[PDB]
Design an enzyme around this catalytic site. Structure first.
Site, PDB file in Angstrom:
ATOM      1  N   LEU A 292       0.858  -1.204   0.000  1.00 16.05           N
ATOM      2  CA  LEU A 292       0.000   0.000   0.000  1.00 16.05           C
ATOM      3  C   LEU A 292       0.867   1.216   0.000  1.00 16.05           C
ATOM      4  O   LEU A 292       2.007   1.193   0.396  1.00 16.05           O
ATOM      5  CB  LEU A 292      -0.967   0.077   1.175  1.00 16.05           C
TER       6      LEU A 292
ATOM      7  N   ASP B 147      -1.115  -6.396  18.596  1.00 21.93           N
ATOM      8  CA  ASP B 147      -0.001  -5.443  18.532  1.00 21.93           C
ATOM      9  C   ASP B 147      -0.286  -4.325  17.544  1.00 21.93           C
ATOM     10  O   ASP B 147       0.596  -3.928  16.755  1.00 21.93           O
ATOM     11  CB  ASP B 147       1.326  -6.090  18.136  1.00 21.93           C
TER      12      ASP B 147
END
Ligand SMILES: O=C1CC(I)=CC=N1
EC number: 2.7.11.22
Length: 280
Positions: A75, A119
């Site tokens: 991305l 996380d």
């Protein structure tokens, strides 16, 4: 690399080096995550099936030459960089709202499929050019088990609880929401105890009233200082009452009292949500 052209280090990821790489067969640009080294291979391979518009696609799991690589779609940019580039002006509120809404859709999807992140942090949130945002690395922490970032860790994790729940991801996202709004990390600890006291000074030291069981958690100590609780109103100005209500519910101490992703999507904060184009 046998199967890639034009391999370039991006940086150090949670599990090993991350590369931008070109697949030799197809010419596509991917994020290649080397895992620094049996059960993890089948479990992560299941994540190749966990597909949603706000989840970074796991394209492949490559296990060759006794090395392991994860191949993800590439991305345009990560949110940590976008946040840094946006610091002088701030991210506009409509875009904050759009990104939070989309991130909650991604969490709701993963959580409904019994996959946690555990996380989350701005580095794992990726944006495209038109206004989408996606979460990367769902499921890896369960499968697998420069300094670690503690800033987004939920208090139950810091207090040594061995049992994760969906609520850990809502906490982390709440911290990221606050950081988008104020242009400063909410709880920038540099050690577990500094992280813990940074949360306690802002929210008050938790007790059995707000968090039944807190005093019996593995790393709880009765000698912790007792701070009174401050108001979100000083913490995330100029966020409006709807945003502060939502944030407050994302940051309840007791994981069981923390708003779910699905319920958060219904919050009045999102009544006027839109999908703006970011200023890259
Ligand atoms: O797809 C990606 C991954 C990372 I890390 C940075 C930018 N794009």
């Amino acid at each position: 690399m046998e199967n890639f052209q034009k391999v370039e280090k991006i940086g150090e990821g949670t599990y090993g080096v991350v590369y931008k790489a070109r697949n030799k067969l197809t010419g596509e640009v991917v994020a290649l995550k080397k895992i620094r080294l049996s059960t993890a291979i089948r479990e992560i391979s299941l994540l190749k099936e966990l597909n949603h518009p706000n989840i970074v696609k796991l394209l492949d799991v490559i296990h060759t030459e006794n090395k392991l690589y994860l191949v993800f779609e590439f991305l345009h940019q990560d949110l940590k960089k976008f946040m840094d580039a946006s610091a002088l002006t701030g991210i506009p509120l409509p875009l904050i709202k759009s990104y939070l809404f989309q991130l909650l859709q991604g969490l709701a999807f993963c959580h409904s499929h019994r996959v946690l992140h555990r996380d989350l942090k701005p580095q794992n949130l990726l944006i495209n050019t038109e206004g989408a945002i996606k979460l990367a690395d769902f499921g890896l922490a369960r499968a697998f088990g420069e300094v670690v970032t503690l800033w987004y860790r939920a208090p139950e994790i810091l207090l040594g609880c061995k049992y994760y729940s969906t609520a850990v991801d809502i906490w982390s996202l709440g911290c990221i929401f606050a950081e988008m709004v104020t242009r400063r990390a909410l709880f920038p600890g540099d050690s577990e105890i500094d992280q813990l006291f940074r949360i306690f000074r802002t929210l008050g030291t938790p007790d059995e009233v707000v968090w039944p069981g807190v005093t019996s958690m593995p790393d709880y100590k009765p000698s912790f200082p007792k701070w009174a609780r401050q108001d979100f109103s000083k913490v995330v100005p100029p966020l409006d009452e709807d945003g502060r209500s939502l944030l407050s519910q994302m940051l309840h101490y007791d994981p069981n009292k923390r708003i779910s992703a699905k319920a958060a999507l219904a919050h009045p904060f999102f009544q006027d949500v839109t999908k703006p184009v970011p200023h890259l």
